[PDB]
Amino acid sequence: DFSITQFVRNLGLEHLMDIFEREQITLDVLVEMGHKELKEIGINAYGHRHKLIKGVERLISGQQGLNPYLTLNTSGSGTILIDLSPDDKEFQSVEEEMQSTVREHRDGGHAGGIFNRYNILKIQKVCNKKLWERYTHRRKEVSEENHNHANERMLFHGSPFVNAIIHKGFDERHAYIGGMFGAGIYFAENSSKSNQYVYGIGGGTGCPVHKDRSCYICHRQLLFCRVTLGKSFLQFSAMKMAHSPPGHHSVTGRPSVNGLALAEYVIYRGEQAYPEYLITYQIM
Amino acid sequence: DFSITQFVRNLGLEHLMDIFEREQITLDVLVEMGHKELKEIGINAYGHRHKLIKGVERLISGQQGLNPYLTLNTSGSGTILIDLSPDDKEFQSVEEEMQSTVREHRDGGHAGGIFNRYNILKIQKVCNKKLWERYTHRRKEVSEENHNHANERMLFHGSPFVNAIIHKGFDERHAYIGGMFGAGIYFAENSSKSNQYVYGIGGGTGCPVHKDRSCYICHRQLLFCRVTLGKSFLQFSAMKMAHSPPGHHSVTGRPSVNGLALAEYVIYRGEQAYPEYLITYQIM
Ligand SMILES: Oc1nc(-c2ccc(C(F)(F)F)cc2)nc2c1CSCC2
Ligand SMILES: Oc1nc(-c2ccc(C(F)(F)F)cc2)nc2c1CSCC2
C-alpha cells in the first residue's frame, strides 16, 4: 500500500489516506476511479477528486513510455478452470467428440495403450484473458488474408507439458522437431492419436507412477483446442519445413495408403491455437 | 408523408410543422430523435420536446403489439453489392480459390462446359443486414449445440436463382429435391462442380442467348458463401433425407471409388448459409 501513499502524499492529500486505507484503495484500483466512484467512497470535495484524477492522468498518460499501467495491472490475470456439468450438453458434446473419434492404431496399442473407449472424469473450460486476446488478434490477421475466413477447427493435442500450455499458451519455441512436417505444433482430429503423446514421444516410459504406457489407473489429460488453419497447405509425404509454406498458414497432413493412417494438422506459430477444453480421463 | 402531420396534430403542436417540413422530418425519423437532436433542429422549448418524446414512447412502446416500429423502419433494408478491387488481396484470395479448385469432371464437360480456368470479371460483397442477422442467430444456435464450435466453411453454390438468393436469402423451401442426399441446399468445395449448375440441373439448356452450356461469351455468376455445418453427418452413399439426421446440423458427402467423385455439403435449413461473395466470370 506504499505506492498509493506516495502518490497521495505528492499531491498534498495525505489526510485522505484514512479513507483510502479503510476502503482498501490501492494504486491499481485508484487509477480506475472517476468522479462518481471517488464520491461513492466519501471524497466529497470536487477539488480533491480533480487533483486525484489529474494525477492519475499524469502518471498513466504522461509517463506512458514507462508503461506504468502494465505493472499496475498484473492482478487478476492468470488462468482459471471452469468445470462443465456432466448433464450440460456442452459436456456431452465434448465427450461425444472424445469417444467417437477413437481408432485402432497400426501399432497394437504400444504407444498409447490398449482400449476402445474412455472413462471421462471431468471437462474444464480454460479461460485466460491475455492468451485468448492473442489468439483472436492472430485469428483476425489470418482472416483478413484468406477472404475473411479463419478456417477455424477444434482438434486434439497430447503433451506432457499441458500445465505449461494452459498457463502460458502454445509456443512454437517448443515445437515438435521430430514431427513428419518439421518443427511445428501438431494437432489431431482423432483423440486416440493425440493420446499417444500424453506421456511423450512414442508414449515415453508411460505413466510416472507405474512406468506403464497402457495404465488404466492414472488420470490422463488432453486438450481440445481451437486452431486457426487459414489457408492450409495439403501434403501426402514427409517434409522438414521450419515455417508454413509461402502464401499459407498451416499444413494439413492427409491420410494415404502408403502414408498417414489418420489426419494431421500443423501450425508454425504458437498464437494460432488456443487450448479451450482440458479433459481428464482414463482409458479402459 | 401525412403520418407525421397526424402525429404532430394530435399532440396540438401544429405550429412546428414548418420546421418538420423544412428539415424533412418523417415519422420514422422522428421516432429516433431525443432531446439533443430535436434541440439541434431548432425545437428549443423543453415542453414541446417532452411532448414529442412522450408521444413517440406511447406509439412505439404503448402500442408494441401492433409493431409500428417494423412498419416505420422498412426503409434502409435491402441488399447492396460492394465491388472488390482487383488489386486487393481479398479479391486475389477469392480468385485464387476460384481457379485452384477447378477439376476435370467425369462427363466430357457436358454440364458446365470445357475449360481449365476462368476469366474473372467482377467480385462483389453481398451486404444485407437482416439476412446476416438471421444467419448469425442460427450460427450461434448451432455453436451452442456443438461445443462452442460453429464449424463454418466457405463453399461455392451455383443456381439460376442467384438474384433471389442475394435479395431474399437461401431458402430450404426451394431445396434441390433431386440431389443424392435429399431435399437440401447443396454446396461444393470445387468451383467447376457448382459451375455445372449455373444454368440449371445438368447445366439446363445453357446460356439464355446461345443455348450453349459451354458458351465462352455470356457472363456467369457463382456464389461463394459462409455455410454453418455444426456437427456434420458423414456419408459415402446416397440416401434421400428430408432434414438433417438426429443430433446433426448438416450432411457432408465424401468422395468414394464407387460413389462421389468430389466433395459435397448439404444443409437442410435456409438460415445456415449466407452468400458473402458474388463472382461474375466467364469460362475459358
Ligand atoms: O497431440 C500430439 N502431440 C504431439 C506431441 C506433443 C508434444 C511432444 C513433446 F513432448 F513436446 F515433444 C511431442 C509430440 N504430437 C502429435 C500429436 C497429435 S498429431 C501427431 C503428432
Ligand atoms: O452449387 C450447386 N448447386 C446445385 C443446384 C442449385 C440449384 C438447383 C435448382 F435449379 F434450383 F434446382 C439445382 C442444383 N446443386 C449442386 C451444387 C454444388 S454440390 C452438387 C449439387
Ligand SMILES: [Zn+2]
Ligand atoms: Zn499409472
Ligand SMILES: [Zn+2]
Ligand atoms: Zn451464350
